[PDB]
């Protein structure tokens, strides 16, 4: 049967034989050793000069969400989001992965689709680019979509009545007023030891959302 | 069957017989005792004067990541990163290795691909070149890609309430 097919459907078509510039609907030349995808709301039949390869299908998508792709040729990798998008003749899904940052991120997955993380308006997170080396920051009630190479700058918050840095971890920075308690012992000059329970009110100032450098100050500390 | 092949595919072609400057598509002369790779989105058939060797394939890559190579001839070794890149007629993958610096580096691998290490913005590390003897340093939130001969200058931090130098190790400087 003729391969009648919806635009959502697609067929890569490797050719066993050299050029088909003649009698092709596109009239385009096609040397052997490299080939192309075909898609669109139309019927199609393989030529004797070319063979069918695979039934790549629609990859439905909405705004602010998508999947990774990488060329087999140049090797360049990029996320794509928004409109529905099939892999082209060479692009292929790529496997992003994280250094145990995933379970916190949740607080089974097809990693090839672009990872994303909703950010609470009080929260802020760092992404230190390894491509353009342009580290950047979000601060507000919005989701964030990574470039595949841009790892999060996860932070290790202290926790417990004693302040132990290793005790907790949170990629988000809850920089709101919410005071944190603290306990530090001290001793008087007359050698009289005493314990203390002492709360700390705290909040980070922001002259502007606009200035990255202040955020660089926000992240300059390993553990504020 | 004719070796029709994608540009991603490649075939080294050792020749059993002397020059083929005639009737070759490239017209290029080719003395016996040394030969060449062939690749490109095209069909190809071996000549009677030459034999097939091996099916080297595509080696997909992205920016700031890659693999080591070394000439069999001159013996020079270099990393290559970014664009996808097959070994040429003589280049071969080379095995970089480390003096137990690997497990800290993680804090099973094909060592032939170039090693790299993400550096936290507070962190900084040293790489003392043994080639050009040009030691250099990174400091910032970015990954670092070694020249294969450029070993890290690992440091031994002190740890514990007593300050014992042997107690801990960290290539990064917080």
UniProtKB/Swiss-Prot annotation, chain B:
Its post-translational modification remark reads: Phosphorylated on Tyr residues after EGF stimulation.
Q: Which residues carry this modification: Phosphoserine?
A: 100
Task: Give the highest taxon in the source lineage.
Answer: Eukaryota
Coiled-coil region(s) at which residues?
none
Q: Where can this protein be found?
A: Cytoplasm; Nucleus
Q: Where are the MVP repeats?
A: 3-58, 59-114, 115-174
According to the record, the segments passing through the membrane are none
Q: What does this gene product do?
A: Required for normal vault structure. Vaults are multi-subunit structures that may act as scaffolds for proteins involved in signal transduction. Vaults may also play a role in nucleo-cytoplasmic transport. Down-regulates IFNG-mediated STAT1 signaling and subsequent activation of JAK. Down-regulates SRC activity and signaling through MAP kinases.
Q: What is known of its domains?
A: MVP 3 mediates interaction with PTEN. MVP 4 mediates interaction with PARP4.
The subunit structure is: The vault ribonucleoprotein particle is a huge (400 A x 670 A) cage structure of 12.9 MDa. It consists of a dimer of half-vaults, with each half-vault comprising 39 identical major vault protein (MVP) chains, PARP4 and one or more vault RNAs (vRNAs). Interacts with TEP1. Interacts with PTEN and activated MAPK1. The phosphorylated protein interacts with the SH2 domains of PTPN11 and SRC. Interacts with APEX1. May interact with ZNF540.
What name appears for this protein in its UniProt entry? Major vault protein
Q: Which residues of the full protein are shown?
A: 322 to 517 of 861
């Amino acid at each position: 049967d003729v391969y009648v097919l919806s635009e959502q459907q697609g067929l890569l078509l490797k050719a066993l034989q050299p050029l088909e510039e003649g009698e092709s609907e596109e009239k385009v030349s096609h040397q052997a050793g490299d080939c192309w995808l075909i898609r669109g709301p139309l019927e199609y039949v393989p030529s004797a000069k070319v063979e069918v390869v695979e039934e790549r299908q629609a990859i439905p998508l909405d705004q602010n969400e998508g999947i990774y792709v990488q060329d087999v040729k140049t090797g360049k990798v990029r996320a794509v989001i928004g409109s529905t998008y099939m892999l082209t003749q060479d692009e292929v899904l790529w496997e992003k992965e994280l250094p145990s940052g995933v379970e916190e991120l949740l607080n089974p997955r097809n990693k090839t689709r672009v990872v994303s993380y909703r950010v609470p308006h009080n929260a802020a997170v760092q992404v230190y680019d390894y491509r353009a080396k342009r580290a950047r920051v979000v601060f507000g009630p919005e989701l964030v979509t990574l470039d595949p190479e841009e790892q999060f700058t996860v932070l290790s918050l202290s926790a417990g009545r004693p302040k132990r840095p290793h005790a907790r971890r949170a990629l988000c920075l809850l920089l709101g007023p919410d005071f944190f308690t603290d306990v530090i012992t001290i001793e008087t000059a007359d050698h009289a030891r005493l314990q203390l329970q002492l709360a700390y009110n705290w909040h980070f100032e922001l002259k502007n959302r606009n200035d990255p450098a202040e955020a660089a100050k926000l992240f300059s500390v390993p553990d504020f």
